[PDB]
Design a protein around this motif. Sequence first.
Motif, PDB file in Angstrom:
ATOM      1  N   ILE A  42      -5.494   9.196  -2.663  1.00 12.66           N
ATOM      2  CA  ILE A  42      -5.050   8.121  -1.154  1.00 12.66           C
ATOM      3  C   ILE A  42      -5.835   9.138   0.197  1.00 12.66           C
ATOM      4  O   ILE A  42      -5.846   9.174   0.907  1.00 12.66           O
ATOM      5  CB  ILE A  42      -3.950   7.114  -0.912  1.00 12.66           C
ATOM      6  N   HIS A  62       4.637   6.556   6.915  1.00 14.99           N
ATOM      7  CA  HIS A  62       5.319   5.046   5.783  1.00 14.99           C
ATOM      8  C   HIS A  62       6.752   5.071   5.917  1.00 14.99           C
ATOM      9  O   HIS A  62       6.915   6.244   5.853  1.00 14.99           O
ATOM     10  CB  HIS A  62       4.538   5.668   4.315  1.00 14.99           C
ATOM     11  N   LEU A 118       3.435   1.135   8.611  1.00 13.75           N
ATOM     12  CA  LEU A 118       1.934   1.916   8.484  1.00 13.75           C
ATOM     13  C   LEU A 118       1.818   2.936   9.710  1.00 13.75           C
ATOM     14  O   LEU A 118       0.736   1.448  10.333  1.00 13.75           O
ATOM     15  CB  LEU A 118       0.528   1.003   7.413  1.00 13.75           C
ATOM     16  N   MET A 163      -0.076   5.229  12.330  1.00 11.89           N
ATOM     17  CA  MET A 163      -1.290   6.087  12.010  1.00 11.89           C
ATOM     18  C   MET A 163      -1.521   6.417  12.956  1.00 11.89           C
ATOM     19  O   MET A 163      -1.727   6.208  14.190  1.00 11.89           O
ATOM     20  CB  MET A 163      -1.820   5.544  11.409  1.00 11.89           C
ATOM     21  N   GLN A 210      -8.512   7.693   5.091  1.00  9.04           N
ATOM     22  CA  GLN A 210      -7.686   7.897   3.546  1.00  9.04           C
ATOM     23  C   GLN A 210      -9.805   7.633   3.112  1.00  9.04           C
ATOM     24  O   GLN A 210     -10.559   7.425   3.090  1.00  9.04           O
ATOM     25  CB  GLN A 210      -7.445   7.010   3.333  1.00  9.04           C
ATOM     26  N   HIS A 238      -9.835   3.530  -1.789  1.00  9.66           N
ATOM     27  CA  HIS A 238      -8.446   3.303  -3.549  1.00  9.66           C
ATOM     28  C   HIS A 238      -8.771   1.580  -3.665  1.00  9.66           C
ATOM     29  O   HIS A 238      -9.344   0.718  -2.978  1.00  9.66           O
ATOM     30  CB  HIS A 238      -7.722   4.325  -3.323  1.00  9.66           C
ATOM     31  N   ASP A 263      -5.284  -0.113  -4.820  1.00 12.77           N
ATOM     32  CA  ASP A 263      -3.683   0.185  -4.960  1.00 12.77           C
ATOM     33  C   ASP A 263      -3.375  -0.290  -6.024  1.00 12.77           C
ATOM     34  O   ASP A 263      -1.992   0.377  -6.102  1.00 12.77           O
ATOM     35  CB  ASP A 263      -3.058  -1.166  -3.767  1.00 12.77           C
ATOM     36  N   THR A 277      -7.309  -0.840   9.181  1.00 13.92           N
ATOM     37  CA  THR A 277      -7.770  -0.896   7.651  1.00 13.92           C
ATOM     38  C   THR A 277      -9.017  -1.059   7.426  1.00 13.92           C
ATOM     39  O   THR A 277      -9.911  -1.771   7.295  1.00 13.92           O
ATOM     40  CB  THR A 277      -6.965  -1.873   6.945  1.00 13.92           C
ATOM     41  N   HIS A 286     -10.030   0.006  -0.480  1.00 10.26           N
ATOM     42  CA  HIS A 286      -9.809   0.137   0.662  1.00 10.26           C
ATOM     43  C   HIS A 286      -9.557   1.779   1.023  1.00 10.26           C
ATOM     44  O   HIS A 286      -8.804   2.116   0.388  1.00 10.26           O
ATOM     45  CB  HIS A 286      -8.650  -0.951   1.974  1.00 10.26           C
ATOM     46  N   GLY A 287      -8.684   1.979   2.210  1.00  7.13           N
ATOM     47  CA  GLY A 287      -8.567   2.971   2.706  1.00  7.13           C
ATOM     48  C   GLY A 287      -8.040   2.742   4.042  1.00  7.13           C
ATOM     49  O   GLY A 287      -8.328   1.677   4.848  1.00  7.13           O
ATOM     50  N   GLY A 288      -6.674   3.541   4.537  1.00  8.51           N
ATOM     51  CA  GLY A 288      -6.625   3.536   6.163  1.00  8.51           C
ATOM     52  C   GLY A 288      -8.059   4.517   7.206  1.00  8.51           C
ATOM     53  O   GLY A 288      -8.501   5.083   6.014  1.00  8.51           O
ATOM     54  N   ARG A 342      -1.308   3.711  15.575  1.00  7.10           N
ATOM     55  CA  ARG A 342      -1.977   2.086  15.682  1.00  7.10           C
ATOM     56  C   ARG A 342      -0.753   1.640  13.851  1.00  7.10           C
ATOM     57  O   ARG A 342      -0.629   2.688  13.250  1.00  7.10           O
ATOM     58  CB  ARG A 342      -3.680   1.870  15.363  1.00  7.10           C
TER      59      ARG A 342
HETATM   60  O1  AKG Z   1      -2.770   2.838   6.421  1.00  5.48           O
HETATM   61  C1  AKG Z   1      -3.403   1.492   6.330  1.00  5.48           C
HETATM   62  O2  AKG Z   1      -4.584   0.962   6.780  1.00  5.48           O
HETATM   63  C2  AKG Z   1      -3.907   1.371   4.749  1.00  5.48           C
HETATM   64  C3  AKG Z   1      -3.461   2.576   4.228  1.00  5.48           C
HETATM   65  C4  AKG Z   1      -3.435   2.318   2.983  1.00  5.48           C
HETATM   66  O3  AKG Z   1      -3.695   1.721   2.165  1.00  5.48           O
HETATM   67  C5  AKG Z   1      -2.903   3.395   1.318  1.00  5.48           C
HETATM   68  O4  AKG Z   1      -1.777   3.945   1.898  1.00  5.48           O
HETATM   69  O5  AKG Z   1      -2.526   2.742   0.279  1.00  5.48           O
END
Ligand code: AKG
Lengths: 285, 284
Positions: free
Chosen positions: B64, B72, B116, B118, B125, B128, B130, B166, B206-208, B217
């Motif tokens: 990720i 986190h 979360l 950031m 990221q 991926h 989850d 996200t 999805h990802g950060g 954020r």
């Molecule tokens: O911070 C985000 O918007 C997503 C974080 C995420 O998807 C993850 O760490 O698995």
Amino acid sequence: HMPPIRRVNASQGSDAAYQILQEDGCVIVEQVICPNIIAKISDDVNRVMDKATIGAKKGEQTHIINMHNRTIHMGDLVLTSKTYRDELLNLPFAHEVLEKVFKKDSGDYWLNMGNILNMLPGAEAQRPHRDDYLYPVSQHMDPATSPDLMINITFPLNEFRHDNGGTLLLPKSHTGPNADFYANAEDLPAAEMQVGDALIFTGKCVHGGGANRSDKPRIGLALAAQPGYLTPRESNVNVPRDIVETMTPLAQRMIGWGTVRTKDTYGLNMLQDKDFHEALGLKSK
Amino acid sequence: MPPIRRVNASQGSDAAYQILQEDGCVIVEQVICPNIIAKISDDVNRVMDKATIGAKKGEQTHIINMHNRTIHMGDLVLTSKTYRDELLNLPFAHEVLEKVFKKDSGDYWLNMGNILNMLPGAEAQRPHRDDYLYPVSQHMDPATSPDLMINITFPLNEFRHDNGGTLLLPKSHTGPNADFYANAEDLPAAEMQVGDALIFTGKCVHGGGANRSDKPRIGLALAAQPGYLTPRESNVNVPRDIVETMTPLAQRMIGWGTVRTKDTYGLNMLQDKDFHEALGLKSK
Ligand SMILES: O=C(O)CCC(=O)C(=O)O
Ligand SMILES: CC1=C2O[C@@]3(C)CC[C@H]4C(C)(C)C(=O)C=C[C@]4(C)[C@H]3C[C@]2(C)C2=C(C(=O)OC2)C1=O
Ligand SMILES: CC1=C2O[C@@]3(C)CC[C@H]4C(C)(C)C(=O)C=C[C@]4(C)[C@H]3C[C@]2(C)C2=C(C(=O)OC2)C1=O
Ligand SMILES: O=C(O)CCC(=O)C(=O)O
Ligand SMILES: [Fe+3]
Ligand SMILES: [Fe+3]
């Protein structure tokens, strides 16, 4: 042709028993543990048998395995037997087999539970089944190629024979498709063993409790283990911490007082973003 | 590229669930009073400096792109009473979670609640799924297998493309598991206000995102899963007297309760009984 249930002595080593388990789904290991340790645990269990639930647990359907009121299943073994906590949970042969089963596909393992299996006199045989039916994802994976979700290690606490309901098994049934019917109990061979032996079988091996036509109870103890990423049937959070800290770190993990890492290195059952033991400052033997 | 679709919570949890089934993700606007989120945000800010930066001990980072410009943070039960009492009982969320899990799996509970954070300069990221956390996901066909995870993210400040809101790939939740899904630069961002929530499944790509702004954020991820899957975070260190001020549902959510599969079998039992019955666990 009904395949026989194959056997090895534990003196032959855990590699040989694992090989039979891979090929057949089940293996009997003779003389894996000192019989006096088993007799001690058996005495502890007999002391408290009047406390257990007969038949079904509250709200649990009975028709899949034929759970009935001539059977007693009993957990709570950590508090029932110190010999169980210190000797059985640390048995090296068992852990060698379990690491061979789980480490590559899944990672760390721990107990589903430890469970007394008391088939009373006149107990009817169970419907042959797969234990992995407990976890619904087993129905969405191909048995021929999917990871094992469970290993059962059953220690007889008195002699197992066909006539007193020793566990029925269908050897080499652990790669076929999942099904709602596998066999009638009367067609299966029984695991016949002495105190100090153990039967090992996977969550995909077709099996079930036999019919007890003797006049004495037939009692075994099931050490059932699974990947750490699957939720144990039995929690141990009510076990006093003072008692947990007399156990080894391995046995602590087995009973859920520890972090369990997947094969991808990711931690589960963490506390405050750290290792379970570290966050508690938990001591151990 | 399909857009990230949205509903107002006033339109009801059915409509949100339908979009979740079709797309793998949905934004629900005005699902929770912004005052509640503000209280939890205060609770979290009061304890943010004790969090770990980047990877936790011994966890590889490359699936990720975990890195040292993201924080986190768990431990929310003890951090925020408002979290224990308001957020864990949000009815819209439980209506959606029941629709997701009840028939295919049974009872559900938290994987964990996870802040979360950031920071500015945080890279995007790797997109991926989850559900890779659970190895069984790789042995099941995504198009027909049960969902193993639902993520509900509540922004604690405004989410926007530019600040790393996200990134999502709508309608990506039925294709085969893969080693590459997309580049982050090509995905839309979930843009929303405090009081909104983003819901997406364990199969949604999805990802950060990249935080290109000057301020952190911060979202709160409430991640839920079948009871038969082990939570990432245990709550056995929460004093029983605090637990007994919670509702039975919130207690089950944090692991202080028995969870039954769709086949009626109990897990997380105590002494062959229901968790609560065996402890005499009280609640509100
Ligand atoms: O911070 C985000 O918007 C997503 C974080 C995420 O998807 C993850 O760490 O698995
Ligand atoms: C599949 C199914 C069950 O799952 C299994 C087999 C899985 C694990 C197993 C182990 C190996 C730990 C054991 O010692 C003997 C029985 C259990 C506890 C069992 C109990 C349970 C929930 C059940 C059912 C029923 O009817 O009552 C009880 C049932 O059908
Ligand atoms: C698959 C993968 C992981 O699984 C996931 C995504 C699954 C659930 C997820 C939820 C939704 C609860 C969240 O709030 C944000 C992140 C986590 C905790 C996450 C953390 C973890 C173990 C990890 C990885 C890594 O690199 O560092 C950390 C990783 O690759
Ligand atoms: O008692 C036995 O020998 C088998 C028990 C069993 O298979 C079960 O209850 O799942
Ligand atoms: Fe069984
Ligand atoms: Fe993610």
